[PDB]
Design an enzyme around this catalytic site. Structure first.
Site, PDB file in Angstrom:
ATOM      1  N   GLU A  15       0.800  -1.219   0.000  1.00 57.16           N
ATOM      2  CA  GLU A  15       0.000   0.000   0.000  1.00 57.16           C
ATOM      3  C   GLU A  15       0.838   1.276   0.000  1.00 57.16           C
ATOM      4  O   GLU A  15       1.588   1.534   0.949  1.00 57.16           O
ATOM      5  CB  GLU A  15      -0.915   0.035   1.221  1.00 57.16           C
ATOM      6  CG  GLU A  15      -2.358  -0.227   0.947  1.00 57.16           C
ATOM      7  CD  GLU A  15      -3.013   0.742  -0.064  1.00 57.16           C
ATOM      8  OE1 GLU A  15      -2.668   1.958  -0.055  1.00 57.16           O
ATOM      9  OE2 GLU A  15      -3.903   0.274  -0.836  1.00 57.16           O
ATOM     10  N   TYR A  87      12.788  -2.801  -7.495  1.00 61.27           N
ATOM     11  CA  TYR A  87      14.076  -2.870  -6.790  1.00 61.27           C
ATOM     12  C   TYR A  87      13.904  -4.044  -5.870  1.00 61.27           C
ATOM     13  O   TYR A  87      13.150  -3.978  -4.863  1.00 61.27           O
ATOM     14  CB  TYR A  87      14.466  -1.537  -6.073  1.00 61.27           C
ATOM     15  CG  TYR A  87      14.662  -0.409  -7.074  1.00 61.27           C
ATOM     16  CD1 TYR A  87      13.827   0.689  -7.088  1.00 61.27           C
ATOM     17  CD2 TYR A  87      15.634  -0.487  -8.056  1.00 61.27           C
ATOM     18  CE1 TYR A  87      13.974   1.688  -8.022  1.00 61.27           C
ATOM     19  CE2 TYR A  87      15.755   0.497  -9.038  1.00 61.27           C
ATOM     20  CZ  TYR A  87      14.930   1.597  -8.992  1.00 61.27           C
ATOM     21  OH  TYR A  87      15.067   2.589  -9.940  1.00 61.27           O
ATOM     22  N   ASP A 131      11.516  13.784   2.679  1.00 59.14           N
ATOM     23  CA  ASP A 131      11.362  12.447   3.181  1.00 59.14           C
ATOM     24  C   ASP A 131      12.655  11.678   2.877  1.00 59.14           C
ATOM     25  O   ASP A 131      12.614  10.754   2.103  1.00 59.14           O
ATOM     26  CB  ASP A 131      10.193  11.750   2.447  1.00 59.14           C
ATOM     27  CG  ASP A 131       9.786  10.423   3.135  1.00 59.14           C
ATOM     28  OD1 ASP A 131      10.329  10.091   4.237  1.00 59.14           O
ATOM     29  OD2 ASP A 131       8.899   9.740   2.594  1.00 59.14           O
ATOM     30  N   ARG A 135      13.316   4.166   5.309  1.00 56.27           N
ATOM     31  CA  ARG A 135      12.032   3.624   4.837  1.00 56.27           C
ATOM     32  C   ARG A 135      11.711   4.094   3.374  1.00 56.27           C
ATOM     33  O   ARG A 135      11.116   3.353   2.618  1.00 56.27           O
ATOM     34  CB  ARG A 135      10.858   3.930   5.800  1.00 56.27           C
ATOM     35  CG  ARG A 135       9.493   3.281   5.438  1.00 56.27           C
ATOM     36  CD  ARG A 135       8.390   3.289   6.611  1.00 56.27           C
ATOM     37  NE  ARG A 135       7.032   3.551   6.071  1.00 56.27           N
ATOM     38  CZ  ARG A 135       5.852   3.160   6.599  1.00 56.27           C
ATOM     39  NH1 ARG A 135       5.783   2.471   7.746  1.00 56.27           N
ATOM     40  NH2 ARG A 135       4.714   3.468   5.962  1.00 56.27           N
ATOM     41  N   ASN A 136      12.206   5.257   2.968  1.00 55.71           N
ATOM     42  CA  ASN A 136      11.946   5.815   1.623  1.00 55.71           C
ATOM     43  C   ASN A 136      13.103   5.670   0.598  1.00 55.71           C
ATOM     44  O   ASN A 136      13.222   6.468  -0.309  1.00 55.71           O
ATOM     45  CB  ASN A 136      11.531   7.325   1.756  1.00 55.71           C
ATOM     46  CG  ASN A 136      10.954   7.906   0.393  1.00 55.71           C
ATOM     47  OD1 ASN A 136      11.376   8.933  -0.083  1.00 55.71           O
ATOM     48  ND2 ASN A 136      10.052   7.201  -0.211  1.00 55.71           N
ATOM     49  N   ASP A 149      10.268   8.340  -3.827  1.00 60.38           N
ATOM     50  CA  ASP A 149       9.591   9.440  -4.448  1.00 60.38           C
ATOM     51  C   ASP A 149       8.765  10.135  -3.433  1.00 60.38           C
ATOM     52  O   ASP A 149       7.552   9.892  -3.377  1.00 60.38           O
ATOM     53  CB  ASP A 149       8.727   8.982  -5.672  1.00 60.38           C
ATOM     54  CG  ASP A 149       7.680   7.904  -5.351  1.00 60.38           C
ATOM     55  OD1 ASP A 149       7.052   7.908  -4.258  1.00 60.38           O
ATOM     56  OD2 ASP A 149       7.474   7.035  -6.251  1.00 60.38           O
TER      57      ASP A 149
HETATM   58  N1  LIG Z   1      10.210   0.473  -7.383  1.00 56.33           N
HETATM   59  C1  LIG Z   1       9.924  -0.309  -6.248  1.00 56.33           C
HETATM   60  N2  LIG Z   1      10.545  -1.474  -6.066  1.00 56.33           N
HETATM   61  C2  LIG Z   1      10.239  -2.180  -4.965  1.00 56.33           C
HETATM   62  N3  LIG Z   1       9.371  -1.924  -3.982  1.00 56.33           N
HETATM   63  C3  LIG Z   1       8.776  -0.755  -4.216  1.00 56.33           C
HETATM   64  C4  LIG Z   1       8.990   0.068  -5.285  1.00 56.33           C
HETATM   65  N4  LIG Z   1       8.190   1.191  -5.175  1.00 56.33           N
HETATM   66  C5  LIG Z   1       7.489   1.039  -4.073  1.00 56.33           C
HETATM   67  N5  LIG Z   1       7.834  -0.120  -3.455  1.00 56.33           N
HETATM   68  C6  LIG Z   1       7.271  -0.652  -2.216  1.00 56.33           C
HETATM   69  O1  LIG Z   1       5.831  -0.579  -2.258  1.00 56.33           O
HETATM   70  C7  LIG Z   1       5.405  -0.160  -0.955  1.00 56.33           C
HETATM   71  C8  LIG Z   1       4.969   1.314  -0.912  1.00 56.33           C
HETATM   72  O2  LIG Z   1       5.120   2.063  -2.106  1.00 56.33           O
HETATM   73  P1  LIG Z   1       5.510   3.642  -1.885  1.00 56.33           P
HETATM   74  O3  LIG Z   1       5.786   4.458  -3.134  1.00 56.33           O
HETATM   75  O4  LIG Z   1       6.491   3.643  -0.743  1.00 56.33           O
HETATM   76  O5  LIG Z   1       4.193   4.317  -1.254  1.00 56.33           O
HETATM   77  P2  LIG Z   1       4.077   5.932  -1.071  1.00 56.33           P
HETATM   78  O6  LIG Z   1       5.430   6.435  -0.652  1.00 56.33           O
HETATM   79  O7  LIG Z   1       2.847   6.336  -0.307  1.00 56.33           O
HETATM   80  O8  LIG Z   1       3.951   6.258  -2.664  1.00 56.33           O
HETATM   81  P3  LIG Z   1       2.689   7.043  -3.362  1.00 56.33           P
HETATM   82  O9  LIG Z   1       3.050   7.537  -4.752  1.00 56.33           O
HETATM   83  O10 LIG Z   1       2.422   8.108  -2.331  1.00 56.33           O
HETATM   84  S1  LIG Z   1       1.248   5.708  -3.437  1.00 56.33           S
HETATM   85  C9  LIG Z   1       6.621  -0.311  -0.040  1.00 56.33           C
HETATM   86  O11 LIG Z   1       6.908  -1.686   0.258  1.00 56.33           O
HETATM   87  C10 LIG Z   1       7.703   0.109  -0.969  1.00 56.33           C
HETATM   88  O12 LIG Z   1       8.894  -0.422  -0.461  1.00 56.33           O
END
Ligand SMILES: Nc1ncnc2c1ncn2[C@@H]1O[C@H](COP(=O)(O)OP(=O)(O)OP(O)(O)=S)[C@@H](O)[C@H]1O
Length: 259
Positions: A15, A87, A131, A135-136, A149
């Site tokens: 999520e 990734y 951020d 975690r990011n 991002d």
């Molecule tokens: N390119 C990626 N490769 C691997 N895991 C990813 C990738 N992008 C996101 N994730 C994973 O997916 C989950 C959350 O996605 P995120 O982008 O961190 O959510 P967010 O930061 O709220 O992004 P948005 O754009 O706001 S939905 C977490 O486990 C992240 O580690």
């Protein structure tokens, strides 16, 4: 460009703020199968959150630094899909936790330097990332991380005094936060100020108290972190200078590891 046919969803990844992220396979214009993460926006908050979703995608689409997450394409028609590189080692904080026994200081310094190169780039365009935390930050390979991002429960324990006090965010507050991220990295993913509650952090900061030096952190590197946490934002280094100091530290830790 990329068409929905070229992208298949295989499982859930997790999520995100706006919606579910899925794992999939994109097939190229050259027939290459690329493992991707596909970001999705929940069919909801009419224009506003959905506008913010797309607007963040277009920035990331224009971002291209080797240590920032790579946007592969955007499928705009409902339901909107943002296709990112997948990734395979997941988040840095988890990856540091798992590999605590085998990671050496050289690598921790290298991840720090990579992030700082990404920030130097952002710094060059006066663009503030708010951020900069493990975690990011995504793990592309044992030797390569990418800043995620992310630029209202704020990351108070990661935030500069100006940010906590006045919600001011500038490249200099990103410098403060980047040093907190170094501290996370060198601590193998501990949360900063884990021993406090959010409301307590500012007052600790206001009296000059700082995150203590992690056990594996070289003193020279802790002094750099210390300069980053200068109360006064004008006195903090800039990212272009951190990149130079951090390359020097890295180069010293490599020689030490190799000899
Ligand atoms: N390119 C990626 N490769 C691997 N895991 C990813 C990738 N992008 C996101 N994730 C994973 O997916 C989950 C959350 O996605 P995120 O982008 O961190 O959510 P967010 O930061 O709220 O992004 P948005 O754009 O706001 S939905 C977490 O486990 C992240 O580690």
């Amino acid at each position: 460009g990329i068409a929905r046919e070229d992208v298949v969803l295989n499982r859930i990844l997790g999520e995100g703020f706006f919606g579910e992220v899925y794992e999939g396979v994109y097939t190229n214009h050259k027939g290459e199968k690329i493992n991707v993460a596909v970001k999705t926006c929940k069919k909801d908050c009419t224009l506003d959150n959905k506008e913010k979703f797309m607007s963040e995608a277009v920035i990331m689409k224009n971002l291209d630094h080797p240590h920032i997450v790579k946007l592969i394409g955007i499928i705009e028609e409902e339901p909107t899909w943002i296709i990112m590189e997948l990734y395979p080692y997941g988040e840095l904080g988890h990856y540091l936790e798992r590999n605590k026994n085998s990671l050496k200081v050289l690598t921790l310094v290298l991840y720090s330097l990579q992030i700082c190169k990404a920030m130097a780039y952002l710094e060059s365009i006066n663009c503030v990332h708010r951020d900069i935390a493990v975690r990011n930050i995504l793990v592309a390979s044992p030797e390569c991380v990418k800043l995620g991002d992310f630029g209202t429960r704020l990351p108070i324990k990661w935030m500069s005094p100006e940010s906590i006090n006045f919600r001011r965010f500038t490249t200099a507050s990103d410098v403060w936060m980047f040093a907190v991220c170094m501290w996370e990295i060198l601590s193998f993913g501990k949360q900063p100020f884990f021993w406090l509650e959010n409301k307590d952090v500012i007052g600790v900061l206001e009296k000059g108290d700082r995150l203590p030096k992690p056990d594996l952190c070289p003193p020279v590197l802790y002094t750099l972190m210390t300069r980053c946490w200068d109360y006064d934002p004008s006195d903090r280094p800039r990212f272009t200078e951190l990149v130079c100091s951090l390359s020097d530290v890295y180069q010293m830790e490599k020689d030490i590891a190799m000899e």
